[PDB]
């Protein structure tokens, strides 16, 4: 619903979604070639399936293609400084792809707006919605459009005849963070097949050991997981599968 939906937010009005209590799968996106650019900072996307994060933030927007370079840590641009600013120590990355077939119109798709003028460069990860008229003269414009009273918001001319730099590009930025809180977001790990009646090195749910695992005839309780003997001897029963 975030990677490919019917409505994506604007660059200046980007949409934030919180991903938590999710079992994410980063292998499918790594293998998918439908995305134009996907390269990430701090953590290699190959090993994203291993690291577990407490919460993830996905911000979706549609920008100009030539502007996809501006969306990076320590980058200076127009939409970078006035619409979406990234922190220098940003953890995560963006996934961007050309979307001229959906986000452009024959007469020009004018539903996408971006801010050109504002008081000063905004802090990273800040949302601006106010459409106050940017005044450049000494006299107060009184919020009335006219001379020397510029409108900061302007619409992109998305047309199929434009170049690849001017084609609309759908970008979803994934940001990962951790703090003194339990982590919940990570992959499904892996479960190799089980073999019986053979001396094996087992790892059940984070408990490791060596021994032979035979079929057993004993009754547990639904919530019970491990097994024990008269002195701290593990007899694991509950298969995680």
């Amino acid at each position, epitope marked *: 619903e975030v990677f490919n939906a019917t409505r994506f937010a604007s660059v200046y009005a980007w949409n934030r979604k919180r991903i938590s209590n999710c079992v994410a799968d980063y292998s499918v996106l790594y293998n998918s070639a439908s995305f134009s650019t996907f390269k990430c900072y701090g953590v290699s996307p190959t090993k994203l399936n291993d690291l577990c994060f407490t919460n993830v933030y996905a911000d979706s927007f549609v920008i100009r293609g*030539d502007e996809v370079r501006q969306i990076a840590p320590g980058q200076t641009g127009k939409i970078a400084d006035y619409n979406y600013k990234l922190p220098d120590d940003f953890t995560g990355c963006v996934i961007a792809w050309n979307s001229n077939n959906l986000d452009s119109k*024959v007469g*020009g798709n004018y539903n996408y707006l971006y801010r050109l003028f504002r008081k000063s460069n905004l802090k990273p990860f800040e949302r601006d919605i106010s459409t106050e008229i940017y005044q450049a003269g000494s006299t107060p414009c009184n919020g009335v459009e006219g001379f020397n009273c510029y409108f900061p918001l302007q619409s992109y*001319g*998305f*047309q*199929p*005849t*434009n*170049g*690849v*730099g*001017y*084609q609309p590009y759908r970008v979803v930025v994934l940001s990962f963070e951790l703090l003194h809180a339990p982590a919940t977001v990570c992959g499904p790990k892996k479960s190799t097949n089980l073999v019986k009646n053979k001396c094996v090195n087992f790892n059940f749910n984070g408990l490791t050991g060596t021994g032979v695992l035979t079929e057993s005839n004993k009754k547990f309780l639904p919530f019970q997981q491990f097994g024990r003997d008269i002195a701290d001897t593990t007899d694991a029963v509950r298969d995680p599968q």
Partner: antibody
Amino acid sequence: QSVEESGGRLVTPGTPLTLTCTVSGFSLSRYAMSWVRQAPGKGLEWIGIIVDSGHTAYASWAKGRFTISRTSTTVDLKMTSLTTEDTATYFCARETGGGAFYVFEFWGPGTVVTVSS
Amino acid sequence: QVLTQTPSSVSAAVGGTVTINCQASEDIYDNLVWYQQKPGQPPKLLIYDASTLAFGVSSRFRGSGSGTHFTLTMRDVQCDDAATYYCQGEFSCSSGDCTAFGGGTEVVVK
């Protein structure tokens, strides 16, 4: 990839004339053909472009009196209400690859359209 | 909407260098190309994206610039470089007239 064109003739003002560009060695449905012209000894002028999908773009100075059409192997351009200042040389130019519009790496030999009595 | 090329004409010796400036009335990012038109020959694209040398062209031609100012410099100009050069850049869309061509410059080597 060879791009050629023809249609040069001497015509009176106000007489419509069509010029046909023939491609060879590539697929037209993937690549954008465009029309440019230059006056004798003067600078280059842009006429229009047709994308591979089929959408059309023109120039403001043209005022909207050109018409560029596409088919199997003939990118044709037609004119109406010729004036005496349209005596120039016309070319059809190809692109580099998918997308990357307005590059014009391959050009036609060149044909001259003259308007006089 | 307006592309400007300076100077209109300039000459230099064989063992010399010259520069050409192309200015755009609007921000065009780096989407700018150059051409060389010999007398009677169709133009050949020399540099595209204002910093990438085209296939089959020499390394004595270099391009730089970004935004609204671009510069093409030729080093050790030979007698074969005597031709006309033009700059072209994409100009947004609906706002302006798609693309436009520059006025061009003439180079002659003594």
